[PDB]
Amino acid sequence: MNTPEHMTAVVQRYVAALNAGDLDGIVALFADDATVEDAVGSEPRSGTAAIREFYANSLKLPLAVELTQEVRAVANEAAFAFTVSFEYQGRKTVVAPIDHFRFNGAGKVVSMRALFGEKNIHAGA
Amino acid sequence: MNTPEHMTAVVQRYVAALNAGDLDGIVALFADDATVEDEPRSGTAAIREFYANSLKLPLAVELTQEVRAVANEAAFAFTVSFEYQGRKTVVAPIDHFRFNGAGKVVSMRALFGEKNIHAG
């Protein structure tokens, strides 16, 4: 089982790498055969290459990412509340999802999902 | 699809029913084939027992951020506080609800670990 400290560390490493625009540091968190989802129902992206292309797209612009509460980490999973703020067709928008990571035994993330709706997408103005 | 409004309203009634200790109020939000987890428990009888156990100590329950609701799911951050033989505990989970087509909750999982159990 992963430790909760490891899992919490990965989540912090994830948020810092988002903020740094460290594409390759994000991918490094994920297993070879991980699956990522932008949003509930979005096309799942599986495998290192689909994951790098996903994160490359996510990082097409500078992101301001803030962890807004403690990470919840238990068993082989973590969930976290956060905000992602960036220029969306030239206007600053702040999206507040809750993400869910599951981890494999090697401690790499095997799955990510970000849960958010329309009411979680905000001006910040 | 469930509307995000309906799902957010259900989260709010869940929180309210926990604060009231209203076991039937809580159970009514769930489907008869729902499963719960803090080792899942499934079906009305087991969900009722789960919540009856959860309610032996009066709970003070508060949403701590806006609810995230989309598709047929919702997630929310909150606290549950209670007193026990001289000591207050505040637990801060993140919950996940899945809803059926009829708008009832079909699964809830409350996610929290040891660091999310706070000494009040």
UniProtKB/Swiss-Prot annotation, chain B:
Question: Active-site residues?
Answer: 14 (proton donor), 38 (proton acceptor)
Q: Name one GO biological process term.
A: steroid metabolic process
User: Per UniProt, where does substrate bind?
Assistant: 95
- EC number(s) stated in the UniProt entry for this protein: 5.3.3.1
Q: How is this protein induced?
A: By steroids.
Q: Which InterPro entries match?
A: Ketosteroid_isomerase, NTF2-like_dom_sf, SnoaL-like, Steroid_delta5-4_isomerase
Source superkingdom: Bacteria
Q: Does the keyword Lipid metabolism apply?
A: yes
**What GO MF terms are annotated?**
steroid Delta-isomerase activity
Q: Which residues form a coiled coil?
A: none
Catalytic activity from the UniProt record? a 3-oxo-Delta(5)-steroid = a 3-oxo-Delta(4)-steroid
Q: Which UniProt keywords apply?
A: Isomerase, Lipid metabolism, Steroid metabolism
Q: State the oligomer form and interacting partners.
A: Homodimer.
This chain's protein is named Steroid Delta-isomerase
Q: Which organism is it from?
A: Comamonas testosteroni
This protein's gene is called ksi
